[PDB]
Write a protein that binds this ligand. Structure first.
Ligand SMILES: OC[C@H]1O[C@@H](O[C@H]2[C@H](O)[C@@H](O)[C@@H](O)O[C@@H]2CO)[C@H](O)[C@@H](O)[C@H]1O
Ligand SMILES: OC[C@H]1O[C@@H](O[C@H]2[C@H](O)[C@@H](O)[C@@H](O)O[C@@H]2CO)[C@H](O)[C@@H](O)[C@H]1O
Lengths: 137, 137
């Protein structure tokens, strides 16, 4: 289920931050934050905290396939507890921060950064805030 | 031209703030921030700073017609200068703040507040940030 979507047709990458605040309803499910590229609504970056297994899975869905999963070692979320996730893009990576700690970097696979125009947030997250802000390099 | 859109299907009214930061490119045009209700994509609240005439026009587009315009006395924008617009909804009004000053209140005409799920920002605004945050009553 779609919880939030945003569209910025001029392109929200690189040099933008997305800050999502909220909490899960359960410890048995998952949510995702996806950055989509146009045309095709391909998934440039999929950030998928899975609470049942306590793993963050990151990947891309390009040319109709999921690529190699990048799975984080730590799981710095607690179910039903408020969190802040920030995703900041530079020319080389998405940088992920949770509760103001840097957690992981994900190297761009979709190199056409300016075609990333859409953000989708799905599944088990009760959102309290979404901020989309142009930062600079 | 669409500059930004957001969708929050559970309803982003009442008790939410939208904070838009940016600046115009010209002093000859206009921009708008629209709150849309579902179904129908009706315009519950249209906030339309018109720089050519230095007037903020507010209205609603319901049942296929614009209603009575509510035109503000002051015009606290300057073309090409960064501004912050906050729109906060309670049970009775949209409250508009520009650069942290309260400017106007617009009484709800679309009373089905929970059906307001979409935000659109159009025309002459170069956006630097959009924040959508659940505040409370
Ligand atoms: O790689 C991200 C996608 O994973 C898909 O699930 C994988 C799963 O992680 C893996 O362990 C294996 O079982 O194959 C599954 C199917 O590709 C998700 O279904 C998808 O939503 C993404 O999260
Ligand atoms: O009321 C908001 C809409 O106004 C429309 O323009 C009006 C205009 O403000 C008024 O002075 C008169 O000329 O009738 C026009 C047409 O209804 C805009 O076209 C529309 O976009 C809204 O801003």
């Amino acid at each position: 289920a779609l919880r939030f979507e945003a569209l910025y047709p001029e392109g929200m990458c690189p040099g933008w931050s997305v800050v999502v605040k909220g909490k899960t309803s359960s410890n048995t499910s998952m949510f995702e934050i996806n950055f989509l590229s146009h045309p095709g609504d391909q998934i440039a970056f999929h950030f998928n905290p899975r609470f049942a297994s306590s793993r963050i899975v990151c990947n891309s869905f390009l040319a109709n396939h999921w690529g190699k999963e990048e799975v984080n070692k730590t799981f710095p979320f607690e179910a039903k507890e408020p969190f802040q996730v920030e995703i900041y893009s530079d020319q080389d990576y998405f940088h992920i921060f949770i509760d103001e700690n840097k957690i992981l970097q994900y190297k761009h696979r979709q190199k056409q950064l300016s075609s990333i125009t859409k953000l989708q947030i799905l599944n088990d997250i009760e959102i309290s805030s979404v901020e989309i802000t142009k930062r600079g390099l």
